[PDB]
Design an enzyme around this catalytic site. Structure first.
Site, PDB file in Angstrom:
ATOM      1  N   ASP A 156     -10.857   2.755   3.870  1.00  0.00           N
ATOM      2  CA  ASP A 156     -11.040   1.541   3.976  1.00  0.00           C
ATOM      3  C   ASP A 156     -12.624   0.984   3.876  1.00  0.00           C
ATOM      4  O   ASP A 156     -13.455  -0.343   3.608  1.00  0.00           O
ATOM      5  CB  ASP A 156     -11.261   0.486   4.848  1.00  0.00           C
ATOM      6  CG  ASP A 156      -9.616  -0.176   5.492  1.00  0.00           C
ATOM      7  OD1 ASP A 156      -9.417  -0.543   4.717  1.00  0.00           O
ATOM      8  OD2 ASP A 156      -9.181  -0.072   6.035  1.00  0.00           O
ATOM      9  N   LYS A 210       0.842  -1.045   0.081  1.00  0.00           N
ATOM     10  CA  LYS A 210      -0.453   0.021   0.170  1.00  0.00           C
ATOM     11  C   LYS A 210       0.409   1.221   0.239  1.00  0.00           C
ATOM     12  O   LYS A 210       0.590   2.327  -1.282  1.00  0.00           O
ATOM     13  CB  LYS A 210      -0.947  -0.371   1.428  1.00  0.00           C
ATOM     14  CG  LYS A 210      -2.098  -0.860   0.998  1.00  0.00           C
ATOM     15  CD  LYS A 210      -3.340  -1.160   2.217  1.00  0.00           C
ATOM     16  CE  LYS A 210      -4.084  -2.330   2.280  1.00  0.00           C
ATOM     17  NZ  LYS A 210      -4.934  -2.528   3.282  1.00  0.00           N
ATOM     18  N   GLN A 242      -4.542  -1.346   9.828  1.00  0.00           N
ATOM     19  CA  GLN A 242      -4.776  -2.711   8.905  1.00  0.00           C
ATOM     20  C   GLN A 242      -5.070  -3.417   9.953  1.00  0.00           C
ATOM     21  O   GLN A 242      -4.663  -3.742  11.322  1.00  0.00           O
ATOM     22  CB  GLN A 242      -3.212  -3.290   8.373  1.00  0.00           C
ATOM     23  CG  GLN A 242      -3.140  -4.344   8.230  1.00  0.00           C
ATOM     24  CD  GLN A 242      -3.335  -4.397   6.714  1.00  0.00           C
ATOM     25  OE1 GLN A 242      -3.542  -2.904   5.668  1.00  0.00           O
ATOM     26  NE2 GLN A 242      -3.888  -5.203   5.840  1.00  0.00           N
TER      27      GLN A 242
HETATM   28  N1  9L9 Z   1      -7.766  -2.209   6.805  1.00  0.00           N
HETATM   29  C1  9L9 Z   1      -7.215  -3.507   5.749  1.00  0.00           C
HETATM   30  N2  9L9 Z   1      -6.968  -4.464   6.709  1.00  0.00           N
HETATM   31  C2  9L9 Z   1      -6.832  -5.436   5.935  1.00  0.00           C
HETATM   32  N3  9L9 Z   1      -6.595  -6.581   5.705  1.00  0.00           N
HETATM   33  C3  9L9 Z   1      -7.231  -5.492   4.609  1.00  0.00           C
HETATM   34  N4  9L9 Z   1      -6.996  -5.908   3.147  1.00  0.00           N
HETATM   35  C4  9L9 Z   1      -6.474  -6.237   2.378  1.00  0.00           C
HETATM   36  O1  9L9 Z   1      -5.264  -5.864   2.820  1.00  0.00           O
HETATM   37  N5  9L9 Z   1      -5.501  -7.466   2.041  1.00  0.00           N
HETATM   38  C5  9L9 Z   1      -4.587  -7.034   0.244  1.00  0.00           C
HETATM   39  C6  9L9 Z   1      -4.616  -8.893   0.296  1.00  0.00           C
HETATM   40  C7  9L9 Z   1      -3.630  -8.736  -0.874  1.00  0.00           C
HETATM   41  C8  9L9 Z   1      -2.894  -7.896  -1.375  1.00  0.00           C
HETATM   42  C9  9L9 Z   1      -1.377  -7.730  -2.200  1.00  0.00           C
HETATM   43  O2  9L9 Z   1      -0.658  -6.771  -2.363  1.00  0.00           O
HETATM   44  N6  9L9 Z   1      -1.324  -9.408  -2.769  1.00  0.00           N
HETATM   45  C10 9L9 Z   1      -0.936  -9.479  -3.992  1.00  0.00           C
HETATM   46  C11 9L9 Z   1       0.215 -10.521  -2.866  1.00  0.00           C
HETATM   47  C12 9L9 Z   1       0.572 -10.021  -1.678  1.00  0.00           C
HETATM   48  C13 9L9 Z   1       2.066 -10.997  -1.358  1.00  0.00           C
HETATM   49  O3  9L9 Z   1       3.572 -10.517  -0.721  1.00  0.00           O
HETATM   50  O4  9L9 Z   1       1.421 -12.081  -0.366  1.00  0.00           O
HETATM   51  C14 9L9 Z   1      -1.385 -10.721  -4.779  1.00  0.00           C
HETATM   52  O5  9L9 Z   1      -1.873 -11.201  -4.333  1.00  0.00           O
HETATM   53  O6  9L9 Z   1      -0.538 -10.930  -6.174  1.00  0.00           O
HETATM   54  C15 9L9 Z   1      -3.228  -6.354  -0.444  1.00  0.00           C
HETATM   55  C16 9L9 Z   1      -4.434  -6.627   0.537  1.00  0.00           C
HETATM   56  C17 9L9 Z   1      -7.856  -4.119   3.857  1.00  0.00           C
HETATM   57  O7  9L9 Z   1      -7.813  -3.663   3.112  1.00  0.00           O
HETATM   58  N7  9L9 Z   1      -7.908  -3.206   5.482  1.00  0.00           N
END
Ligand code: 9L9
Ligand code: NAD
Ligand code: NAD
Ligand code: 9L9
Lengths: 286, 289
Positions: B120, B53, B97
């Site tokens: 969010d 992020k 988060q």
């Molecule tokens: N407050 C809050 N908490 C939360 N837990 C979330 N969800 C929340 O951040 N999800 C999320 C999942 C994956 C990735 C991401 O960067 N995924 C990459 C790789 C992730 C990794 O390195 O493992 C991918 O799917 O390709 C980013 C955000 C949110 O949106 N808000």
């Protein structure tokens, strides 16, 4: 095919409320008071509001219906709502829908104080409901849920089709029935399909034949016919059509395991669950 | 064979659009937007996502800061920080988060973020407004799922959609967005949506997915979705992220042979979540809602 009597179930519920209100008054508390605001001359609305204040008196809840002409403006309705919000004698406040087209229904619903919102239409109550939190639940969806629970019809793991998606009826019904039994406000843990005006009739049938519980809340007569239902499933008719529901009652009568009639089904349950909400509001539990 | 939808490519394009909107906002003489992320504890997945992020923030020209706190923080201390940030006019967006430790009530935390800074979309008023199809700050992962579908041109009106999962931050908003009226304030997908969950028997899930034009899996169960469950040509969107290597809920290789479209894990919904968060932050900085 058991024909579930909504009249008999709401009788039990209203007796429970009458007991809870008498005990509440016996311990020295103020008697609950429900204020209903009614706008215009919709004959169904007047009938429905009359059924609500009749049931209130029967369970020891005081009431007043405040009738206004349809020519009322939005600002004058808001003024009335605000006076009632500040009247400590009023525990529950509801504005009967539909309102005239020149009045913004969502602004009116959000103007009722949340602690007095026995309809559960305030956006905070909608939000809390959708998060499975303790909330004032809307009367008709809660009535559907009670019909199912008190008849002992299982929901956990079962397939449920809801026909309709209105924010006051179809959507809260789908929320209650699919959500987690273990949460603050328990849900039914079912598998819920939401259909609506853009679901093709053929796609509706392909999901209803799979359903252990079909809940029709669309307002179209004969929307639910016997070929759509599977043997032994429960069919709950929320629709009200000028009087019949949405189900072909006589035909589906011969295939379902359970069925609700129209009238005498969900309708009197709506009035009964409003009584529960009103004593809840009087107690300030939420 | 199935078109693989690159969520990273879509997300990178969306970030270019946000970058242009932020630069125009700043050139018009408004303060540059600033996002604050509160990270509690040491969940490694959480640290990863928050790093992604804050990177995306820098890419799109939004200032940012991650504030890390020990998991042993108390609820009151978290609320004090949140209140401080609520009252800092330099902060446009604020998010905590998830997940938080057991001794901190996530709902009370989410409700303490000022709603104008709630990028969010977790504040109860934003939830309520979204469930009423009113204008609202939409949560990033469900909005990212919606954008994958819309930007790829996959139709939803009248179609059958199955969502596996009902969590309040992911599966429930996805189901709400996809079934609701196209004509309302915040448009919906007008799809016929089946909501399944941990008590849906495997045989009943399959009986619904096999009818579906779109299957959206947000359960967190490797190989929950397999090629026999999917009708040929269907779109399959894998929201799950499971450590087994990182896999999704979908049998990628198997369903790849039957689906019309499919998203990979990683590189699918994940980066779309980060992109839709940048969109919400410029929205929050503009005080549009
Ligand atoms: N407050 C809050 N908490 C939360 N837990 C979330 N969800 C929340 O951040 N999800 C999320 C999942 C994956 C990735 C991401 O960067 N995924 C990459 C790789 C992730 C990794 O390195 O493992 C991918 O799917 O390709 C980013 C955000 C949110 O949106 N808000
Ligand atoms: N106590 C009771 O029995 C009780 C209480 C309240 C409302 N109702 C009744 O419930 C019905 C619906 O409630 P509302 O007034 O909120 O409805 P509404 O008029 O707002 O919309 C009804 C819903 O039905 C859906 N629908 C329309 N055509 C459909 C189709 N072919 N297939 C599937 N769904 C379709 C619509 O999209 C909409 O979501 C009405 O008959 C209403 O009077 C009954
Ligand atoms: N951007 C992203 O891709 C992104 C963001 C957040 C979370 N996730 C991932 O999505 C998954 C779920 O996230 P969450 O926050 O909703 O998790 P959660 O643990 O809060 O919810 C899990 C949900 O899956 C349902 N479920 C469990 N078993 C099931 C089964 N057999 N069939 C159907 N439903 C079943 C549960 O009932 C529940 O609704 C995880 O893989 C998580 O890491 C992905
Ligand atoms: N604010 C608000 N507005 C609303 N319009 C409602 N719905 C809202 O009153 N529904 C309703 C429907 C039927 C009956 C009812 O009494 N039905 C009886 C008979 C009615 C009749 O004679 O037509 C029956 O079906 O057996 C009661 C309430 C509500 O709950 N809140």
């Amino acid at each position: 095919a058991v024909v579930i009597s909504g009249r008999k179930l709401a009788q039990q519920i209203k007796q429970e409320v009458r007991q809870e209100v008498e005990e509440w008054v016996a311990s020295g508390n103020k008697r609950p008071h429900l204020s209903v605001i009614l706008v215009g001359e919709n004959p169904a609305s007047h009938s429905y509001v009359l059924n609500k204040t009749r049931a209130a008196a029967v369970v020891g809840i005081n009431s007043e219906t405040i009738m206004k002409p349809a020519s009322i403006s939005e600002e004058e309705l808001l003024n009335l709502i605000n006076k009632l919000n500040n009247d400590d004698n009023v525990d529950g406040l509801l504005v009967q829908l539909p309102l005239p087209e020149h009045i913004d229904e969502r602004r009116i619903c959000n103007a009722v104080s949340p602690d007095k919102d026995v309809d559960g239409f305030h956006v905070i109550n909608v939000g809390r409901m959708c998060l499975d939190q303790y909330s004032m639940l809307p009367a008709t969806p809660w009535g559907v849920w009670e019909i199912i629970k008190r008849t002992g019809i299982p929901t956990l793991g079962k397939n449920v089709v809801v026909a309709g998606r209105s924010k006051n009826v179809g959507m809260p019904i789908a929320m209650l029935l699919h959500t987690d039994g273990a949460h603050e406000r328990p849900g039914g843990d079912a598998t819920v399909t939401i259909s609506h005006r853009y679901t093709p009739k053929e796609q509706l049938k392909k999901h209803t034949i799979l359903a252990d519980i079909v809940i029709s809340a669309a307002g179209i007569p004969n929307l639910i016919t016997a070929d759509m239902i599977k043997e032994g499933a429960a069919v709950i008719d929320v629709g009200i059509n000028r009087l019949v529901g949405d189900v072909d009652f006589e035909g589906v009568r011969q295939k379902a395991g359970y069925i609700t009639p129209v009238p005498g089904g969900v309708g009197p349950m709506t009035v009964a669950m409003l009584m529960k909400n009103t004593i809840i509001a009087a107690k300030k539990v939420l």
